[PDB]
Amino acid sequence: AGRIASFLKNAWAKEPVLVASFAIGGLAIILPSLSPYTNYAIRINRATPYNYPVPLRDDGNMPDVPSHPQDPQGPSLEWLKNL
Amino acid sequence: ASKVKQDMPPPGGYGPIDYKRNLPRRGLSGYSMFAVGIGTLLFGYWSMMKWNRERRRLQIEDFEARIALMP
Ligand SMILES: CCCCCCCC/C=C\CCCCCCCC(=O)O[C@H](COC(=O)CCCCCCC/C=C/CCCCCCCC)COP(=O)(O)OCCN
């Protein structure tokens, strides 16, 4: 409690550069695990169509695959518009 | 016959001459400077977040234009 307080006071008095470096590094290490937007970043990376979407041969047993891009089936990027 | 004339100090004396160190304080507190820096950083972060999200949307749009034109 007080030992670490005195150590931090001495470090702030003598090496503010190292104190700031360690604080920034620790924040960069720990904060991403608590953020709700990391999943949004992953989804944004997943939603970028780098290559052509190859169509599937219809066999009459794919109710969740669209037959046209404007059909309601398939993934939606409405969440991205409002983000 | 006239009075003796010589280079002499004026009657009374001379005005006081300053010699001591004069370095005024002339500065803000550390907390104020650090707070200004952190606020500037937060404002920039929020602005760039919006701008990069919009840029990602635009990139997706032109990628889809490519996908439409590919066949
Ligand atoms: C968990 C974070 C890890 C990742 C982030 C860090 C990334 C980069 C930072 C690390 C770089 C390497 C730094 C290595 C430190 C060397 C220490 C040392 O030996 O230097 C001492 C001096 O430094 C010391 O005083 C020894 C250590 C003192 C403590 C330093 C910081 C320790 C942690 C402080 C902050 C903790 C976290 C921040 C919380 C803030 C509180 C809210 C010798 O000084 P000289 O230059 O040789 O003197 C010549 C003239 N006399």
The separation between the first and the last C-alpha atoms of chain B, rounded to the nearest angstrom, is 122
The resolution, in Å, is 2.5
Amino acid at residue number B8: M
Contact A48 B63 (CB under 8 A): yes
Contact A81 B57 (CB under 8 A): yes
Contacts of A35 in chain B (CB under 8 A): none
Experimental method, per PDB record: cryo-EM
Spacing, Cα A14 to ligand 1 middle (Å) = 10
Q: How many CB atoms lie within 10 A of CB A44?
A: 19
Give the dihedral sign, CA B63/B51/A43/A61: negative
Which tokens is A11 given?
């470090």
Give the dihedral sign, CA A40/A41/A45/A46: negative
